[PDB]
């Protein structure tokens, strides 16, 4: 019986009466301000519109609902029906009777019974409540959609007002259409609402041309009523777009503060050029390795240290299985190998460890290659440097450099001798596959 | 699952009267009622009226008559003095400072206008415009309303927005039609360029087309049927349209100030969700593992929003309370089971001034079986079960503890089956508070041993 | 003879000049709008506004500079002399020149050379780079009149050249004013700037109600770039006055954000309805105590150790004095007990302490009084509460009972007997000053 | 005193050839004008004119002459690949990315017209509208520009708004013509309602009414002399005046940001000094103390905006070239005179990493005789004197160590006479350094001692 939300089957039947929901809001308003009786063909496009909200007014009893009180899915036939009874189920039932029927109850019915279908548009504000929790959406541009909507249905609204008050007037003159169309009935739908249409934009934008205005003073006060909603619209609408340039512009503006830091430090403390260039090239790397590096460091360090090793052990230790320097090693040592290694990102032709100098720390090629040098030989991926000298405490034999953009793992020797100061009898296969390269 | 979980975290992320009776207060909120009246008739008495006439001024005399009595009753009314704090009950201060501030427009604004016209015939209207002088009780009302938590400060700053441009579009109306009205011609006039009889027309075909001009005007749809005649009307016209220019720059700086200040903590929880969410597709992570990671962090933001929340509140605030308030803190976030019946008082605050609160995702598995016994919990919300299924867990219950004090691996592993709160400590942490005054914490070890 | 900047006698002559330059700034585009000659009484006030201006071509021989390379004001008057001949001696000294003499070179100068006047806005531009630093005046306030006036400005300038456009043309008719007027010429010079002035505020404005607007090309040519023009000012001036809002509202934000936190801490741990109060109480009090309590130790918490030692010396050594339990005691032990003390505010009717409870803390009264609770006696300014139970080590004798706003200094006893770790030997005095109140 | 120095801490808050060889920028740079040209052209001869004529055909085919040759030269041009970051020189992969890319669009719009209307004589201005795809150029150059440290952001961005509103403008303007050029009765358009008839007139006349229209119209200024006559006309000024909303809303929001981010450095600083104002103020410091404490609180704020910069500058950056920096600092902000010559390596880093940078105004006194020596320093920048004088005080040059390492009473009080940058040592973490290799402590000492 009852279907969950969120299954898939059911948000294209929610996806599809959305699009029915936008139909309404044109049809509601043009039938209340343009037509007077039901007609061919939008009186049977109404009925099959309604014959499928009537199908939903069934299939919305058998769906269950998210009790944010407890976090479940209440699957209770008894509770969603009772649920729906209470919640507007009798709003959404009126909203489907046809407009014949609800036309011999009185003639005078039509477009005003018309109107109360813009009940649906519950179902548009539910769907951007969805988008602007999803993920795969950007938020502020989500605004903008629903920012784009309410204008241009307030346009369309509007128009469909006016012109009411005009085509109800006792004499065609003294209307805001007719002082300027000798006759606007007997004239076509089409350039009557495109007339209306325009009137509507030209105020709402503030334009304001004046070849149509208000004659009379049922207009003036219709129109001094539309004007201050559009005050309050626009003041809206530009806040909103101030706040998505304010937050989609902030990456430039803090790569900039960032760059203008660094070379004020340089400035200050009259570092060398060389120098100088090559931290300005580290920080510029950086904000081009957003996607990975950046928006890696930036989640991993946030993470509890449990999901976070088996991040590690997914991404890593099929790394860690080609180091012949590990072969046979205790798993669990490994697993701490990779735990405590950091990741880092370097630029082409760049030094990440020279000769002669002390062995603080040593590294592992995940991607990118590099020459020992003078030069000796070249390091592959999945390829280990600088420990040598960390087992033997003397300094490094060869500078190691960059010749593509590369990605190193790192560790540290005074944390690397805690490591072996664990595990203490697998230091031996430590020992002795070190002494096997060294063979 | 974890999105909507992170989309429930979205969510949630003698004689004296005292000024603060409430008998006093709704006749205050009542005032304020007569205000808005008086802010709407003032203008419409100076702009459209030569001399008082049924109903208005009638309803003008009972208006007055309201005010007259706010004039004696606030002799009888305290006030507080920043010096020290206390209501001032004395007769002769209340008195003085009511004399030495506002009493005088007060009085004056009360006068009736059927008693000022026999000073001068032409005072009426003009006199009419010192009634606004009433307009303080409204700012007023404002004041306290945006520094009150019980309201809502979109709405409060949205009133005051309307109020403002409403009130400029009834005065602007009003004036520009006397300019119009006291003119020699009235051809020559802004309205009589297109009604060429307008005095004859109805008071309110006059006020719908001034407040239509006005309303025009400001928001610059400017259709130009009505405008400008003559010289007066032109000068008028730029000093309201130089106002309009910086009321409109207001409206706008207020609405941006605040569409940012209630989306910004939105911001702050969208960055962190969607870096992750960009790492885990970069790296094309399993889905099986992402959303038990974005689960976690967006449990953690939870977690630490409440923590700086705590401290903030906390810190600010002098000894003698934040004592009182640690001190009911740590006396009742413990002592949740029977284990810790008879602890002492240091080795109580020595642990619940050290464990940390977390939560935990529904359907998930808090500690594991035949695991070291790293660390334990107490459970504060929700519900979870030992497990096949032993016994369920409840809150106000612990688990894991057996393995640490007395050290043995985990005898169970624990699920939840609703979101969760817990309180961890490790038994690190652990070691080192049981190092305080060990005896007490052999007497936890007798509390566990059967 | 060289006079300093920030001279008094020198800021007043400066503040005057930027009088005359506002009647340059309004003077200037109406002569060359609508003026032909020099005619009185225009002639000769402009005369004495040069001779002004001429006087001041003098005086800025003789007065020194502020060379910000070295941070010194510089005296030297082949310096000073050389600077200003470098630094726009000529343009001041052209902009002095009577309009008669500059229109014997030509007749036609008159206009044209009157504009060259304008010049003098760069001291507008200097005033309001000095209120922009100056503490005495708010910020954006200042910014706000900046941009009044560039708009003022901006509309008199328009409306002088859209006049002088349409007087220059070879027929009245065929101009945006003749147009509308049957004669402009031979009209008063009043009607004709007010309906100029009109015409560019409802531009500027964009209300447009389209009475005056361009008929030929070289108005529509200037009108382009008016419109132009106004965009961006109109853009800028919704800038910075959002900027002024949302820094001018931020106290209450503040206020707001502070209550919701510690409410939210309450209905978290369901902490007893009276401490609560108490809480949100003492939080009301901080914010209505920003010109004092708050502001006090928002600054002092950052100042160095020896002013801020200097302050504690000024604003309490006095108080100092008033207590008994340390008469005669060494000097830098008081100084040292003014320096550790804290300072506090507390509301009527609080208990700072409790009797029975630990003798953590004492307290001096610096204002407001209290009462020993029932009640035993009452404490007044200048007074101590707490001691002997910090020298005793036993639970505190009384409860203290505020019953105003209260200030107190604070001390912690951990701290107290370090300082009398410190002076032992005056520690004597201490010693003996309590058991002769003890007496 | 005090106010110019917190006035001045305000104001201080093969055949390959490469892609960055500055002939081929300069080309690059070149270029771009002519996309301008194209900007401005082809909406022109959609709009006004009907085939191709002097000069602007013959300036057309010079302009596509100048793309063509740049057609063939992007064989040539060398790209750097984001997965190695090296520069691809292998003719065979630039070729193949050129082709795979932007070749064929490139190729068409640089076919001559007067080849195109071979093919029809109605495609002349449809085939011109193409050329728009070179506008991709100009937004490739404000993508470099805006992060470019060279130039100011503020300039670029108002650059970028400057040309989009314009290039709607024109497009407008031309669009709006050809619905009134094209249409079957002059005297029912837009323009031929105003001019009787506009086709006799001047090409500068009628470009400068849509022009003027355009305007008018975005800024919704909206005089309403020209409008909408027809249902053509109505239909594209529907859609004209929405895009104008979104454009404007964008303008504004653009220069809101702007004016936020300029701004707030200025306003960080402003709170602290207003603070400290209003408490010198409201306790009625004297104003001889007042300026003393202004002028710390401006050289502390100064002091410590350079060390966030220090750290987030360091604390990013990979630990080899993190490494190199750290050293370079500590061997060249140490050894400042002769008192250190021979210091050991670990000495110096224990002391360069601990001592403490701060800023000193004008005309006051760091330290004074016979007090005790709490603490010595280092001169950075700035003079002193020591005090009557005895001599003057260089940069590169120490006070107060003398009574430090040796413990005596200083000897001098020193006075500034220019604004003072001085590293700070206090005797406690003095004597903590000089406890670790004590023996490299006693030479320091012999060093002294005289
Ligand atoms: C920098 C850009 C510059 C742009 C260019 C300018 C060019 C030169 C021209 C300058 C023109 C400037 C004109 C003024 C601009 C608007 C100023 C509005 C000020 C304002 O609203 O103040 C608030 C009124 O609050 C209140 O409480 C008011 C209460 C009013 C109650 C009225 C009740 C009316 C009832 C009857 C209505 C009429 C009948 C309708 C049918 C005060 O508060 P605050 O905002 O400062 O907040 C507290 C701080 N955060
Ligand atoms: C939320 C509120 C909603 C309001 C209500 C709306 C109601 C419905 C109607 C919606 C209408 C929307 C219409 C669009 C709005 C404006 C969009 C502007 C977009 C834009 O400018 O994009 C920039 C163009 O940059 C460029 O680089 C462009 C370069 C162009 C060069 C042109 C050269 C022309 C030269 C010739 C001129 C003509 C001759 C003049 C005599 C891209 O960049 P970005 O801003 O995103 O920046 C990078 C991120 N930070
Ligand atoms: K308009
Ligand atoms: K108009
Ligand atoms: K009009
Ligand atoms: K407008
Ligand atoms: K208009």
């Known amino acids: ?103 011999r109850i009185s003639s005078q019915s039509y477009g005003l019974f018309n109107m109360l279908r813009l009940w649906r548009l519950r179902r548009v ?79 709402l934008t503030t334009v ?19 004007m201050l909603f559009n005050l309050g619209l626009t003041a809206y609408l530009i806040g909103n777009m101030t706040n998505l340039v304010v937050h989609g512009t902030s990456r430039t503006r803090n790569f900039r503060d960032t760059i203008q830091a660094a070379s004020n430090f ?7 050029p060389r120098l100088q ?17 950046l928006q890696q460091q930036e989640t991993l360090d946030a993470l509890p240290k449990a999901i976070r090793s088996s991040i590690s052990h997914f991404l890593f230790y099929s790394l860690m299985d080609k180091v012949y320097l590990f072969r046979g ?14 990741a880092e990102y370097f630029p082409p032709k760049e030094d990440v460890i ?6 603080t720390d040593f590294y592992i090629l995940v991607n990118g290659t590099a020459d020992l040098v003078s030069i000796v030989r070249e390091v592959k991926a999945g390829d280990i440097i600088g420990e040598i000298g960390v087992l033997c405490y003397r300094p490094q034999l060869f500078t190691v450099r960059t010749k593509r953009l590369c990605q190193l793992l790192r560790m540290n020797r005074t944390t690397f001798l805690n490591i072996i100061q664990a595990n203490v009898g697998d ?10 390269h060294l063979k």
Not at 157 to 186: D, H, M, Q
Not at 329 to 342: A, G, P, R, T, W
């Open 1 to 103: 019986f009852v279907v969950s939300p969120y299954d898939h089957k059911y948000r294209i039947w929610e996806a599809f009466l959305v699009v029915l929901v936008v139909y309404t809001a044109w049809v509601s308003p043009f039938e209340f301000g343009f037509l007077r009786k039901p007609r061919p063909p939008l009186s049977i496009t109404d009925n099959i519109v309604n014959a499928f909200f009537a199908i939903d007014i069934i299939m919305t009893f058998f769906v269950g609902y998210l009790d944010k009180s407890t976090y479940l899915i209440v699957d209770d036939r008894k509770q969603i029906a009772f649920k729906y009874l209470r919640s507007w189920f009798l709003l959404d039932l009126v909203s489907t009777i046809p407009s014949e029927a609800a036309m």
């Open 125 to 203: 504000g539910a769907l951007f409540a969805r988008l602007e929790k999803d993920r795969n959406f950007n938020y502020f541009w989500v605004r903008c959609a629903k920012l784009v909507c309410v204008t241009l249905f307030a346009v369309h609204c509007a128009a469909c007002f006016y012109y009411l008050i005009a085509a109800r007037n006792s004499n065609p003159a003294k209307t805001w259409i007719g002082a300027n169309v000798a006759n606007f009935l007997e004239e076509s739908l089409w350039m009557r609402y495109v007339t209306s249409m325009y009137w509507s934009i030209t105020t």
């Open 208 to 226: 304001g041309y004046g070849d149509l205005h208000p004659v009379n003073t049922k207009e003036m006060i219709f129109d001094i009523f539309y």
């Open 266 to 272: 340089a400035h200050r403390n009259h570092l060398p």
């Open 277 to 293: 260039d090559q931290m300005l090239a580290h920080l510029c790397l950086k904000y081009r390795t957003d996607s990975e590096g």
């Open 329 to 342: 090693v205790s798993n669990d040592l490994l697993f701490q190998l990779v735990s405590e290694m950091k």
């Open 354 to 359: 020279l000769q002669n100098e002390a062995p």
């Open 427 to 436: 230091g031996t296969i430590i020992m002795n596959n070190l002494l096997q």
